[PDB]
Amino acid sequence: MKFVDEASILVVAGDGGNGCVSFRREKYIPKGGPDGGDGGDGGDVWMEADENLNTLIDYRFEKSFRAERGQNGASRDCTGKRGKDVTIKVPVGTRVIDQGTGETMGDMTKHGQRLLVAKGGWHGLGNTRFKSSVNRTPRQKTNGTPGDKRELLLELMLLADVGMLGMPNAGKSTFIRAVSAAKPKVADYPFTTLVPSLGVVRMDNEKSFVVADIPGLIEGAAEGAGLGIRFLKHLERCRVLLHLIDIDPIDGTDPVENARIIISELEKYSQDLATKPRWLVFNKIDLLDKVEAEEKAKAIAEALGWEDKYYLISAASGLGVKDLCWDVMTFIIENPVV
Amino acid sequence: MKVRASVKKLCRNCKIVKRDGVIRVICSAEPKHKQRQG
Amino acid sequence: MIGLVGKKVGMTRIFTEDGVSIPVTVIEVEANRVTQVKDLANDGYRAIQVTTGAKKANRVTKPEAGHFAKAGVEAGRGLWEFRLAEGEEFTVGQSISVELFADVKKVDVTGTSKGKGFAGTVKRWNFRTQDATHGNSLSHRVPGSIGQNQTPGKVFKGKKMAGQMGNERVTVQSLDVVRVDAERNLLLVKGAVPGATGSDLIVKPAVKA
Amino acid sequence: QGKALQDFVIDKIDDLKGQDIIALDVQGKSSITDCMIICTGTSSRHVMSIADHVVQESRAAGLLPLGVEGENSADWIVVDLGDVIVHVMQEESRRLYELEKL
Amino acid sequence: MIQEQTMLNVADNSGARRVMCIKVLGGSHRRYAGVGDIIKITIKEAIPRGKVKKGDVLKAVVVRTKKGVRRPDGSVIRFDGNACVLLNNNSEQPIGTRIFGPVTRELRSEKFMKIISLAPEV
Amino acid sequence: SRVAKAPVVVPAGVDVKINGQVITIKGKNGELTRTLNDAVEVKHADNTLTFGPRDGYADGWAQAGTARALLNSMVIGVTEGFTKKLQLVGVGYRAAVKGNVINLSLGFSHPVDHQLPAGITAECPTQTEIVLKGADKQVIGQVAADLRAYRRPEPYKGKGVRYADEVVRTKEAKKK
RNA sequence: GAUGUCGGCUCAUCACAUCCUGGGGCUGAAGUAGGUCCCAAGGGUAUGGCUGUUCGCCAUUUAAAGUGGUACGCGAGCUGGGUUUAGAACGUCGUGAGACAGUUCGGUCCCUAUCUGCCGUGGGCGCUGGAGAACUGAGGGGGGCUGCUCCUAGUACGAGA
RNA sequence: AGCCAGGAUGUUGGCUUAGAAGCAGCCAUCAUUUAAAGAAAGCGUAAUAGCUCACUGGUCGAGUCGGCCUGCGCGGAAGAU
Ligand SMILES: Nc1nc2c(ncn2[C@@H]2O[C@H](COP(=O)(O)OP(=O)(O)NP(=O)(O)O)[C@@H](O)[C@H]2O)c(=O)[nH]1
Ligand SMILES: [Mg+2]
Ligand SMILES: [Mg+2]
Ligand SMILES: [Mg+2]
Ligand SMILES: [Mg+2]
Ligand SMILES: [Mg+2]
Ligand SMILES: [Zn+2]
């Protein structure tokens, strides 16, 4: 369901098989020889990238994934079977990090790409493998090489096409309800949402886009002491970054000051988000019953001076929801670079 | 439910009952404490 | 309800209006006459004894002649009993026709299958023939092993080997009836029935769904 | 139904914005049908949507389709409406499979 | 019938000429493939410029059988040569763009309309 | 045992007949009869019913107190009656009663029909509300369990049928 | 005082510490699909390349290609590839004859069933006068496998997939 | 042991804290009228709420609670004709 990154996984490669110290005795042959089958190769844990997945909810409990013990070498030159490979379903774009001198082993690129994370243990050679002129009755046995005990950290970035950035007083969460059916928590208090949530806007069967709402940020969010600026990491992948500004906020009462305060820490996260074409729309229009609604819209739009196309919408019900979505999708078409 | 030779009251809300000649533990709060084979 | 007893005359196909060919078996049924009706008081179970066809007077001996004369029925090829279904009733001497099969639409046919004589293990139990080459000596259609070593030390009952095959009662269930003829006394049943041409067959309404 | 399903299918496809509608009156060249309709699909999802739309309306019309093929892959999907086969396929599939031969 | 290790011809212009039915699909202990069936083939002879190469393993659909096809009226459809249409491994769709030769009506019953539509015969 | 130390009192208009080890509490709300264990004795007395065991029985007072409990519910059911409350939560969940049969629609592919005992009646004040009226607590409890067993609630969304006073576990589950 | 061994073929049977199908509990069980545990032996439980191979690796299916016992089942049922008497050769050891739980080439698999057992089929007698039929059933045996598609329903669930 | 009630007063205790009002973090943990109330153990709310707990009152009315020694039992306990 929801989008949660920063998953951790523990994976162990299958231990290699164990040979057996056995000797062959037949009907007429008391001295047959060292006849002990070698062990089986240990299981191998694999990585698989699927287009369908876009979240790591299945790995927030960090289960321990076990590759089965390699089959022990049986007597009478019976080689044990190798353990079956373990494949973990992973989305596209995840980062692979080890705990302790960890590095990026590989980045998921396309569907079906396979990455090796831990190679299984080698099989244990039986007494058949150590007979020679020096020693003719080998009693020595080799333990299979142990599997790889590795700690894995999975980092995933947001795959949404539209990202939202606005104050907690702005109707970011309630706008998802007007454009989709996702049912996030909506209430009259600051910082209602704690983690980013997804939403898909499907007005037609042929064409659709994914829009995600991001938890609100405050004046002091730039340096920290709140939720920080870490939730803007799930950006730079969205084609367009919709911006919501609360007209005549109930508890803000400073529309001019807080309108430009978003850009303050936007210009200070890491590189000012490369100044991607973020739009600018207002919300809570139904609160202003009449001509006063858009009369203040131009007054607050001239303060920014951007002067580009602005949309007057109300996230409560309709009133620009059905037409703003088309323009958002229109922007998507001509720009296919993610 | 877990089935094991040793059965004990894991939490304060575990009742030990003898059903059909075997020892069982019933947890009214939540069903993770169900045991058998006492 | 009860069924009928008749004789198979052969097999023939039936062409439908859409061109589909239905291979059917043609069974002639003579008007069966009830020779006895059983009751709980006397025998403890309800059944009716019927006969079909005709038998030569010289071949018919006195014991069964009195049996036929008691019911007022002439000689018959054989005698059979059909179990009643808790509410249906028949009287002694009543002739049984064939039109009652106009609604069952599913019949069960029992008869003595063809006799194949002493059949081998391969033919009877559908065993696997051993290799005919690669050094094989005097063992092609032999059964092979028939048990384990001395620990069992015997051959279990019901073990599959050669013996008399066929010439026994065989039941084929859920056979569709195609057409029934009253004035000609023919019954057309879809599929193949056990036995050879001219053998006696017992047809009953299907017991399964 | 005859000479009426020809216009019925075209109306249903055009109801969902089909492009380059062509009707081939294969009266005797083919031994399975009487006429054929080939239509283009803008995208993979559009092709599936067109196929579902024509099948669903056919059931309400009173004719059950005999089957469809291009379900998993939307490159080319066919619908068997009895005497009429209707092909809806992507932009690429109409050139690799050149359907002007019949 | 059609069983494993059987030389097979091609009824399409994918690029192959002679393939090997070497595994028949449908269930456990599958012995034979009828006229409409999914089989696994390996390329034994193909044009170098064709869409497929030598040694490739993929799925095929039978089209014509030596033994024949039993119609519901006791009529058989015999043929001189065994042919198949090549399909992609993941998705059962024809690879070739044309069908060369007659095709039985039985493929219509099993919802194989790609072969039936672009086949200039039965 | 010690629960049986408190004899029960029957209200006015309640007739009690003893014919050995069978007890009848027939009255305003129907007629019912129960056979005993042949080991506990009830003595006819003033307007109060007492219980006692037989000498020479190992169980003794342990099982005698059981009759004191069941007979207590008998007088309640014949004068006040027994009420069982079941409610339906979830979309597509409807309940209706036609005579002696409750009609159920619980997201299945076929309607569910239940046949009630002779002395059990059910009413549907709301499409998602069924109330069971009976004279014996054991019978209505079995009936309520039968209704509950079809769609026992799951702890993720709570969909299913439940008692009015029953509290069910709620889980915030998120994975796969 | 003796062919008798491993593997393969034919034929199987039994146990459940259950591979699938069946019934459930818990879950870090949204659903499909999985993790673990309990009951359950009715049925079913793969084809090829390599090697003699059992076992394995590989290719491709299936719901699965279960674990073991039965003189590591079964050679008075078959095979004789492995090993291997007598021949010969290579490497090594020894002066040598020769040897080597080192390798390579070739190298006789007998039996007409007495008894128990089993598969079928008969004669004698009995069942209390004899005979001809037709049945109830004390008991015994056979069979019990399952894939895919559609409707329910793109419904419950799920932001969507 | 059940049942019916009470279970606050400065006081949202101070700091960090968007939110720490007892139950995300630390600290002191003293002290008020009471038969009793701990800035306090668990559920829940981001936090308020909303449920308990420690403890007290009333009806009910006679044994109740938890340690030892000993006899006989229960599970632990699945294999092949
Ligand atoms: N009438 C009206 N009220 C609105 C509208 N948009 C928001 N509101 C009101 O203002 C409140 C703002 O809260 P909310 O929308 O949940 O904020 P948010 O998007 O969740 N931001 P954050 O996650 O940071 O708390 C809403 O709960 C609602 O009461 C609107 O268009 N019309
Ligand atoms: Mg929000
Ligand atoms: Mg429609
Ligand atoms: Mg589909
Ligand atoms: Mg869909
Ligand atoms: Mg489907
Ligand atoms: Zn517990």
Domain residue limits, chain C: 1-209
Phi, psi of A296 (to 5 degrees): -75, -25
Beta bridge partners of residue A209, listed in sequence order: A201
DSSP E18-76: EEEEEEE-SSTT---B-SS-EEEEEEEEE-TTSSS-TT-EEEEEEEE-SS--B-TTS-B
Question: Nearest CA to C35 among C25, C47, C17, C22?
Answer: C47
Identify the chains in contact with C, defined as 3+ C-beta pairs within 8 A. E
Residue by residue, what is the 3-state secondary structure of A77-116?
Answer: CECCCCCCCEEEEECCCCEEEECCCCCCCCECCCCCCEEE
| Residue that is written with structure tokens 């600026």 in the block | A229
3-class SS at F25?
A: coil
Q: How far apart are CA C107 and CA C122, in angstroms?
A: 32
Tell me whether residues E72 and C19 touch, CB distance under 8 A: yes
Q: Ligand 5 centroid to D46 CA: how many Å?
A: 13
Q: Residue length, chain E? A: 122
- Chain E residues in contact with D87 by the CB 8 A cut-off are 117
Domain boundary at F50, F80, F110, which?
F80
Q: If we measure between CA atoms, which residue out of B11, B12, B34 comes closest to residue B24?
A: B34
E89 interface with D at CB cutoff 8 Å = no
Contact A60 F174 (CB under 8 A): yes
In this structure, which residue's CA is closest to atom 16 in ligand 1? A186
F8 part of a folded domain: yes
Residue A177 Cβ < 6 Å to ligand 1: no
Q: Cα dihedral sign for C62, C66, C69, C75?
A: negative
* Strands F33-35, A45-49: pairing kind: unpaired
Give binding residues of A for Mg(2+) as ranges: 173, 193
DSSP symbol at E102? -
Q: Round the CA-based radius of gyration of chain C to a whole number and report it.
A: 23
Q: How far apart are CA F87 and CA A91, in angstroms?
A: 42
CB C31 within 8 A of CB C185: yes
Q: Which of E34, E86, E81 is nearest to E58 (CA)?
A: E86
Chain A hits for F175, CB-CB cut-off 8 Å, are 57-58, 60-61
How far is residue C17's CA from residue C88's CA, in Å, rounded to a whole number? Answer: 38
CA distances from E92 to A106, D1, D26, D74, E36 (A): 33, 32, 27, 12, 13
Which residue puts its alpha carbon closest to atom 32 of ligand 1? A284
CA E120 to chain centroid: 16
Half-sphere exposure of C170 toward its Cβ, with a 13 Å CA cutoff? 15
d(CA E37, CA E23): 11
Q: Distance between CA atoms of A80 and C192, rounded to whole angstroms?
A: 53
| Of the candidates A233, A240, A272, A259, the residue with the CA atom closest to the CA atom of residue A167 | A259
Distance separating alpha carbons of residues A162 and A201, to the nearest angstrom: 10
Residue F3 burial (CB count, 10 A): 13
Phi, psi of C182 (to 5 degrees): -90, -50
Residue numbers in E near C20 (CB within 8 A): 72-73
Where are the strands (E) in chain C, listed by range?
A: 4-15, 21-28, 32-37, 47-52, 78-83, 95-96, 107-112, 115-119, 163-166, 169-175, 177-181, 186-190, 200-205
Residue whose CB lies within 8 A of the most ligand 1 atoms, among A2, A175, A185, A186, for a mutation test: A186
A287 in contact with ligand 1, CB cutoff 6 A: yes
Is residue A57 within 8 A of residue A1, CB to CB? The reply is yes
**How many Cβ atoms are within 10 Å of A263's Cβ, its own excluded?**
14
Q: Which residue of chain D is at minimal alpha-carbon distance from E99?
A: D97
d(CA F165, CA F73): 20
Those chains having 3 or more beta-carbon pairs within 8 angstroms of chain E are: C, D
- Give F174's contacts in chain A (Cβ within 8 Å): 1-2, 57, 60
Those residues whose C-beta lies under 8 Å from the C-beta of residue A224, and which sit 6 or more positions away, are none
Which DSSP symbol is given to C157?
Answer: T
Give dist(CA A288, CA C5) in Å, integer: 94
> CA of E96: which chain D residue's CA is closest?
D97
Task: Please classify residue A149 by burial: count the beta carbons closer than 10 Å to its beta carbon, then call 0-12 exposed, 13-18 middle and 19+ buried.
Answer: exposed
Classify residue C2 by burial, with Cβ atoms within 10 Å: 0-12, 13-18, 19+.
buried
User: φ, ψ for residue C151 (rounded to 5)?
Assistant: -60, -50
Provide the CA E28 to C1' G19 distance, Å, integer. Answer: 15
Neighbours of A80 (CB within 10 A): 25
| Whole-angstrom distance, CA of residue F138 vs CA of residue F132 | 12
Phi first, then psi, for residue A308 (nearest 5°) are -80, -170
Q: Supply A51's token pair.
A: 């287009």
Tokens at residue F44, please?
């006819």
Tell me whether F175 touches chain A (CB under 8 Å). Answer: yes
CA atoms within 13 A on the CB side of A139: 0
* Best residue for ligand 1 mutational test, from A164, A167, A174 (most atoms within 8 Å of Cβ): A174
- Ligand 1 pocket check for A186: Cβ under 6 Å: yes
Structure tokens at E81: 């040569």
Q: Collect all residues with Cβ–Cβ distance below 8 Å to D98 and sequence separation of at least 6.
A: E97
Reading across the β-sheet that carries F33-35, which strands appear in turn? F17-18, F22-24, F33-35
- Would you call C96 exposed, middle or buried from its count of C-beta atoms within 10 A (0-12, 13-18, 19+)? buried
CA–chain centroid gap for C178, Å, is 19
- Per the rule left: phi > 0, alpha: psi between -120 and 50, beta: everything else, E107 is alpha
Instruction: State the angle between helix axes of F61-79 and F137-150 in degrees (0 to 180), rounded to the nearest 10.
Output: 80
Reference C102, options C205, C191, C193, C207; nearest CA is C205
Q: Which strand G nucleotides have any atom less than 7 A from protein CB atoms?
A: 4-6, 9-13, 24-33, 37-38, 45-47, 52-65, 70-75, 77-80, 82-83, 92, 101-102, 110, 116-121, 131-136, 141-142, 147, 151-153, 155-161
- Burial of residue A189 (CB within 10 Å: 0-12, 13-18, 19+) is exposed
Q: Where are the domains of chain E?
A: 1-122
Cα separation, F101 vs F116, in Å, equals 6
Kindly give the pairing relationship between strand C186-190 and strand C177-181. Answer: antiparallel
Cβ under 8 Å to E: C residues 15-44 = 15, 19-21
Question: Residue A312: enclosing H or E segment and its boundaries?
Answer: strand A311-312
Q: Which residues surround ligand 7, an ion (CB under 5 A)?
A: B 10-11, 13-14, 27, 33
Instruction: Say how many Å lie between the CA of residue A328 and the centre of ligand 1.
Output: 21
Q: Tell me the β-bridge partners of C109.
A: C172, C203
CA distance F175 to chain A (A): 4
Contact D97 E112 (CB under 8 A): no
Which tokens is F120 given?
């059990």
* CA of residue A16 relative to chain centroid, distance: 33
Closest listed residue to residue C125, CA positions, set C98, C153, C159, C148 = C159
For chain E, say whether D91 makes contact (Cβ under 8 Å): no
Annotated binding site of A: 166-173, 191-195, 213-216, 283-286, 314-316
For the record, the structure tokens of C37 come out as: 């009706």
Q: Interface partners of B (3+ CB pairs, < 8 Å)?
A: none
Q: Do the beta carbons of residue A15 and residue A70 sit within 8 Å? A: yes
Cβ of residue C13 closer than 8 Å to a chain E Cβ = yes
State how far residue D96 is from chain E, nearest Cα, in angstroms: 7
For B1-38, where are the E strands, in sequence order?
Answer: 14-19, 22-27
Amino acid in position F158: G
* Local structure of residue A239 (DSSP, 8 states): S
Report how far residue A278's alpha carbon sits from residue D59's, in angstroms, rounded to the nearest whole number: 47
In which element (H, E) is residue D80 found? strand D76-80
* CB of D26 closer than 8 Å to CB of D56: no
Q: Which token pair is E30?
A: 């599958």
| For ligand 1, atom 5: residue with the closest CA | A284
Residue A245: nearest ligand to its CA? 1
> C60-64 long-range CB contacts below 8 Å, 24 or more apart?
none
SS3 C26: strand
Of D67, D73, D99, the CB nearest to E93: D73
Whether D28 and chain E come into contact, CB under 8 Å, resolves to no
Q: How far apart are CA F16 and CA C60, in angstroms?
A: 77
Domains in chain F, number: 2
- Secondary structure, 3-state, A116-165: EEECCCCCCCCHHHHCCCCCCCCCCCCCCCCCCEEEEEEECCCCCCEEEE
Whole-number Å distance between alpha carbons of A216 and A227 = 9
Domain membership flag for residue F176? no
F73 and F134: one domain? no
Taking the centre of ligand 2 as the mean of its atom positions, its distance from the CA of residue A197, in whole angstroms, is 9
Q: Give the domain extent around A329.
A: 162-334
Among E107, E115, E118, CA closest to D99: E118
Listed residue (D80, D79, C130, D81) closest to D89, CA to CA: D79
DSSP state of A231: G
Lookup result for tokens 């040793």: B6
Using a 6 Å cutoff on CB, does residue A267 contact ligand 1? no
Residues F65, F115, single domain; the answer is no
Cα–Cα distance measured from residue E26 to residue E39, given in angstroms and rounded to the nearest whole number? 9
- DSSP strand pairing (A23-24 vs A33-34): antiparallel
Q: Is C95 exposed, middle or buried (0-12, 13-18, 19+ CB in 10 A)?
A: exposed
Footprint of strand H on the protein (CB under 7 A): A 187, 189-191, 194, 218, 225-227; B 5-6, 21-23, 37-38; C 151-154; F 2, 5
Solving technique: cryo-EM
Ligand 1 atom nearest the C-alpha of A167 is 24
D47-D50-D52-D57 Cα dihedral, nearest 10 degrees: -170
CA distance A126 to A121: 15
Question: Under an 8 A CB cutoff, do C20 and E72 touch?
Answer: yes
Sign of the CA dihedral with D57 first, then D62, D63, and D68 last: positive
* Secondary structure E strands in chain F: 17-18, 22-24, 33-35, 40-43, 50-53, 82-89, 93-98, 101-106, 112-115, 121-126, 129-134, 160-163
Resolution for this experimental structure (Å) = 2.4
Instruction: Give the residue ranges of DSSP H helices in C5-164.
Output: 62-70, 121-125
Query: What separation in angstroms does the CA of C20 have from each of A54, A106, C176, C190, D82?
Result: 55, 64, 15, 13, 20
A249 within 8 A of A171, measured Cβ to Cβ: no
- Which residue range(s) make up the domain with F68? 2-80
Residue A150 pairs in a beta bridge with: A11
